[model samples]
Target: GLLCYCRKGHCKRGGRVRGTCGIRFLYCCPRR
Candidate 1:
């Protein structure tokens, strides 16, 4: 995962996103 900065919501606005990392589901989505 690149590092989407951990957003509240983007699973819809930003597709191809994955919730990863140690604790807490961070927005590990590919950002531009």
Candidate 2:
């Protein structure tokens, strides 16, 4: 398992959560 920082509801498999600034880039989890 890889450790990643993502915002709430960003992680699909329930992993680490982090906040990201700016709208130029948005995090999207892959659908399993």
lDDT string, candidate 2, 1-32, tens digits: 23443444354554333434235333443332
- Candidate 1 lDDT by residue in tens digits, 1-32: 44565555434356655664345544656654
CA lDDT for candidate 2 = 0.40
Measured by lDDT, the strongest candidate is 1
| Clash number for each model | 0, 1
| CA lDDT, every model vs. true structure | 0.52, 0.40
lDDT of residue 16 for candidate 1: 53
Candidate 1 lDDT score at position 23: 56
C-alpha RMSD by candidate, in order: 4.3, 7.5
Model 2 lDDT-worst window of ten: 17-26
Clashes of 1: 0
True-structure lDDT of candidate 1? 0.52
